[PDB]
């Protein structure tokens, strides 16, 4: 492995790597990373545990971030810095080279996306956004799907049409239940879900044009 000063330097640099759309970053459990920091003297006033066997971090172990099962999905409600830290490919690869990845484990890879409402900045998308999808007139039958903040309304509407078996020849109009209250039109297909203000649990309602050319009234209840 690289020496402790090289590790501290290399990783300090890589933690600050510019976020660029489409790049892949990797989660590292903060518990493992905290031991690594002690071991290499990262942000250390007195270097008291630097190089000490007692804080050698061992193989990278992200098991604490994962739910049970073979698929190994990420636990929900994890917080950046507190529960995990993020490194770019080169940083992840260096840690693996120096410490190994715990045998049997897979890396936890996430993508950088442009985020924000119209005004954009890059962010590693650790969690996708779940939207509730339904058909006008049968709003009781809700199907949930997860989408990226950078997915467009066109992309979402196409998925809704697939789910509810709406044929290509049928025209649709998609609506947001804004404040879980008013129907508001999703009539701009190139907006991303965040441009359009759609967040976790948002209810979207699709309607199909009638054969006679008219559009169905929207479903309302007490």
Swiss-Prot record:
PTM field: Phosphorylated. Phosphorylation protects against ubiquitination and subsequent degradation by the proteasome. Ubiquitinated, leading to degradation by the proteasome.
Keyword Ribosomal protein: no
Domain named DUSP: residues: 2-113
Source organism, top-level taxon: Eukaryota
GO biological process: BMP signaling pathway; monoubiquitinated protein deubiquitination; negative regulation of antifungal innate immune response; negative regulation of transforming growth factor beta receptor signaling pathway; positive regulation of RIG-I signaling pathway; protein deubiquitination; protein K27-linked deubiquitination; proteolysis
Region (Mediates interaction with SART3) location: 1-217
Tissue occurrence: Expressed in skeletal muscle, kidney, heart, placenta, liver, thymus, lung, and ovary, with little or no expression in other tissues.
GO MF annotations, alphabetized: cysteine-type deubiquitinase activity; cysteine-type endopeptidase activity; deubiquitinase activity; identical protein binding; K48-linked deubiquitinase activity; SMAD binding; transforming growth factor beta receptor binding; ubiquitin-modified histone reader activity
Alphabetized UniProt keyword annotations: Acetylation, Cytoplasm, Host-virus interaction, Hydrolase, Mitochondrion, Nucleus, Phosphoprotein, Protease, Thiol protease, Ubl conjugation, Ubl conjugation pathway
Localization (cell): Cytoplasm; Nucleus; Mitochondrion
GO cellular component: cytoplasm; cytosol; mitochondrion; nuclear body; nucleoplasm; nucleus
UniProt signal peptide: none
Family statement: Belongs to the peptidase C19 family.
Function: Hydrolase that removes conjugated ubiquitin from target proteins and regulates various pathways such as the TGF-beta receptor signaling, NF-kappa-B and RNF41/NRDP1-PRKN pathways. Acts as a key regulator of TGF-beta receptor signaling pathway, but the precise mechanism is still unclear: according to a report, acts by promoting deubiquitination of monoubiquitinated R-SMADs (SMAD1, SMAD2 and/or SMAD3), thereby alleviating inhibition of R-SMADs and promoting activation of TGF-beta target genes.
Subunit structure: A homodimer structure has been reported; however it is unclear whether the protein form a homodimer in vivo. Identified in a complex with the COP9 signalosome complex (CSN). Interacts with SMAD1, SMAD2 and SMAD3; the interaction is direct. Forms a complex with SMURF2 and SMAD7. Interacts with TGFBR1. Interacts with SART3; the interaction is direct. May interact with RNF20 and RNF40. May interact with PRKN. Interacts with INCA1.
Protein name: Ubiquitin carboxyl-terminal hydrolase 15
Primary gene name: USP15
Span covered, complete protein: 6 to 222 of 981
């Amino acid at each position: 492995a690289a020496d402790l000063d090289t590790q501290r330097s290399d990783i300090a640099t890589l933690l600050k790597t510019s976020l660029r759309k489409g790049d892949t970053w990797y989660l590292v459990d903060s518990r493992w990373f905290k031991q690594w920091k002690k071991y290499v003297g990262f942000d250390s006033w007195d270097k008291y545990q630097m190089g000490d066997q007692n804080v050698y971090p061992g193989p990278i172990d992200n098991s604490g971030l994962l739910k049970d099962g073979d698929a190994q999905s990420l636990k929900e409600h994890l917080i950046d810095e507190l529960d995990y830290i993020l490194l770019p490919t080169e940083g992840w690869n260096k840690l693996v080279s120096w410490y190994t990845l715990m045998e049997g484990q897979e890396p936890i890879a996430r993508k950088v996306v442009e985020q924000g409402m119209f005004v954009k900045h890059c962010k590693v998308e650790v969690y996708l956004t779940e939207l509730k999808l339904c058909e006008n007139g049968n709003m009781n039958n809700v199907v949930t799907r997860r989408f990226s903040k950078a997915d467009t309304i066109d992309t979402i509407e196409k998925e809704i049409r697939k789910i509810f078996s709406i044929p290509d020849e049928k025209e649709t109009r998609l609506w947001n239940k804004y404040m879980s209250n008013t129907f508001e039109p999703l009539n701009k297909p190139d907006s991303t879900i965040q441009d359009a203000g759609l967040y976790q649990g948002q209810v979207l309602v699709i309607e199909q044009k009638n054969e006679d050319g008219t559009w169905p009234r929207l479903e309302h209840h007490h």
